[PDB]
Write a protein that binds this ligand. Structure first.
Ligand SMILES: [Mg+2]
Ligand SMILES: [Mg+2]
Lengths: 257, 257
């Protein structure tokens, strides 16, 4: 019996394609000569934003530039400074990226009718979530609980946020819970948490596509991109992979049998 | 691979036979004119002390008698009142019951040599543990971390405290941890938390015998009560049972395969 589902936020319940952080991540590196790609900017998506900045400076290709430019590799000063700007730019647009993804609300309402708790973990800080959650609620979305990396010792890939969700929801064991995410870090989080782990494809950070891009992309080109994402989720621990949240119910039924 | 081991306190690491509260639970019920057996007083051993008193007033036999004497079932005021008496008495003699069991420290140090994290959960309140922890640490025992029901939403059999241990000890998944306990509620905590659950017999609250009673007893009767406890632990989820802590190491190595 699955008693609770723990949802990721960006790329899973709100912000289709997880675009809020994408342009900001590139902006803070561009202003210094390092032109990171969208694909690199998306690789560590899901972890705490500051950890994400660090992960980017860690990547060989990104560290390669920086060193050759500033004549030295990134230091804790360079990370903290860019993250600082990340926040200033992020906070101004953040209210715009809290729109519940297309069919998530109906799935949430469906899970509640059945008495399934609605938990959630995040890559955003608490300060960011006061904005995201308030704005999302205005738009019709508010989970039963919400834990940010600020509430536990560390964010993803660690299962700490998931454990806190369980405590406050009163659900045990962990296998009585499903974790639904859209990034590679969400999958590692679910598995490290010992919970049934699901990956959403459309609207995910891993696809990196906007709604319009999905609706207008060549059908074959899309599927090709969908399988790449599905395979990525699988290689990274996903027990299940769903194209949209509309299949969540099916995964739940499968698990219970 | 087992990365950490969580131990119960009274009856597992310290206070052989778990006698510290036994006569207290008995004293507070006898005062009200409702006598309770040692077996009854021990059945819910492990739960947060206050929860333990509520569990006693919950037991059909005890509830029946109270209804006979007072013409009503125990009130929250009664439980609250009894618990106030439980503390006043328990505190005065707590220090005397916080001494490590014969050969536990040996296994403990042997585990630390193998790079193993040592966590702990309890039924004693934080305030209560301050006394036990300080005194226990004076006699050679001090785990890497300790959690009480005051730290989480509820104590045993809930797995909350264990998750806290997991968070703070940076270990995951839960099955990379072993829960070592001596009560039924300890077995339930381990299983509820998704970890390797092991019950210790000699010195457990489930045995209820002191060291002298164990040695001064016939080898037929001892191997009779040990089998009762062993069967109790197992029927309650224990994966493995050990007569003494010196068998833990083997259980681990067994699990590694
Ligand atoms: Mg996510
Ligand atoms: Mg115990």
């Amino acid at each position: 019996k699955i008693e609770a589902v723990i949802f990721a936020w960006a790329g899973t319940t709100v912000d289709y394609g997880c675009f809020a952080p994408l342009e900001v991540f590139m902006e803070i590196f561009h202003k210094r000569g390092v032109a990171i790609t969208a694909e690199e900017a998306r690789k560590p998506m899901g972890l705490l934003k500051i950890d994400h900045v660090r992960a980017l400076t860690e990547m060989p290709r990104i560290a390669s530039e920086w060193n050759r430019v500033f004549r030295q590799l990134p230091t804790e000063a360079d990370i903290q400074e860019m993250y600082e700007e990340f926040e200033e730019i992020l906070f101004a647009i953040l209210p715009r990226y809290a729109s519940p993804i297309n069919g998530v609300k109906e799935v949430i309402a469906s899970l509640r009718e059945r008495g399934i708790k609605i938990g959630s973990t995040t890559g955003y800080t608490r300060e960011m979530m006061d904005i995201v959650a308030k704005e999302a609620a205005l738009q019709g979305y508010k989970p039963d609980f919400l834990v940010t990396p600020d509430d536990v010792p560390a964010g993803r890939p660690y299962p700490w946020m998931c454990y806190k969700n369980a405590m406050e929801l009163g659900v045990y064991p962990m296998n009585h819970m499903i974790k639904v995410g859209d990034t590679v870090s969400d999958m590692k989080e679910g598995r490290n948490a010992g919970m049934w782990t699901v990956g959403v494809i459309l609207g995910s950070s891993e696809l990196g596509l906007t709604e319009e891009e999905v609706e207008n992309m060549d059908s074959v080109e899309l599927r090709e991109k969908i399988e790449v994402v599905r395979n990525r989720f699988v290689e990274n621990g996903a027990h299940f992979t769903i194209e949209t949240m509309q299949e969540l119910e099916s995964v739940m039924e499968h698990i219970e049998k």
